[PDB]
Amino acid sequence: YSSTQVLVRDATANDSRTPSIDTLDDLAQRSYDSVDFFEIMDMLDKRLNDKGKYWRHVAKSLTVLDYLVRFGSENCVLWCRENFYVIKTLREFRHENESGFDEGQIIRVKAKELVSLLNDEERLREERSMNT
């Protein structure tokens, strides 16, 4: 029974837990309600715009977005198309920790893939056709 604010905040929290499928699928289901959608995308917008030490907000928000564009509301797709700039800037996201370790690498990878997916509307439609 968790609120949508708490669910989306926990899913994208700054910690090393990756969002659970349980959580991604509940988000996806909730994305079909216009009020929940507002809440989910509000938080994801904030977190995708984070930088530097808060890279985990980005990485996780990207995972959520990647799941929503396949399993959530068609509005999740339209949102990414409307805010495509945010996603595209993430293909070059950098954060080197003070040990000289690139944490951005996986974000780049995912952002490159999601931009690719978004631009290949026929492939995206095929995937979306398999959702329940």
Author numbering: 16 to 147
Provide passages from the article that reported this PDB entry.
Clathrin-mediated endocytosis is essential for protein retrieval during neurotransmission and receptor recycling. Accumulation of the adapter proteins at the plasma membrane initiates the endocytic event and contributes to membrane bending. Complex formation has been observed between the ENTH domain of epsin and the ANTH domain of Sla2, the yeast homolog of human huntingtin interacting protein 1 related (Hip1R). Epsin and the phospholipid PIP2 are essential for clathrin-mediated endocytosis, and we show how assemblies are formed between the ENTH domain of epsin and the ANTH domain of Sla2 in fungi.
The Ent1 and Ent2 ENTH domains (ENTH1 and ENTH2) from S. cerevisiae as well as an ENTH domain of homologous epsin from C. thermophilum bind up to two PIP2 molecules per domain. We tested complex formation between the S. cerevisiae ENTH2 domain and the ANTH domain of Sla2 to verify the assembly relevant to the ENTH2/PIP2 crystal structure. Indeed, an assembly with a stoichiometry of 8:8:24 ± 3 for ENTH2/ANTHSla2/PIP2 is formed, similar to the ENTH1 complex and ENTH/ANTHSla2 complex of C. thermophilum. When equal amounts of S. cerevisiae ENTH1 and ENTH2 are mixed together with ANTHSla2 and measured by native MS, a complex containing equal amounts of ENTH1 and ENTH2 is formed, showing no preference for either isoform and highlighting the possibility to recruit different epsins into a complex with Sla2.
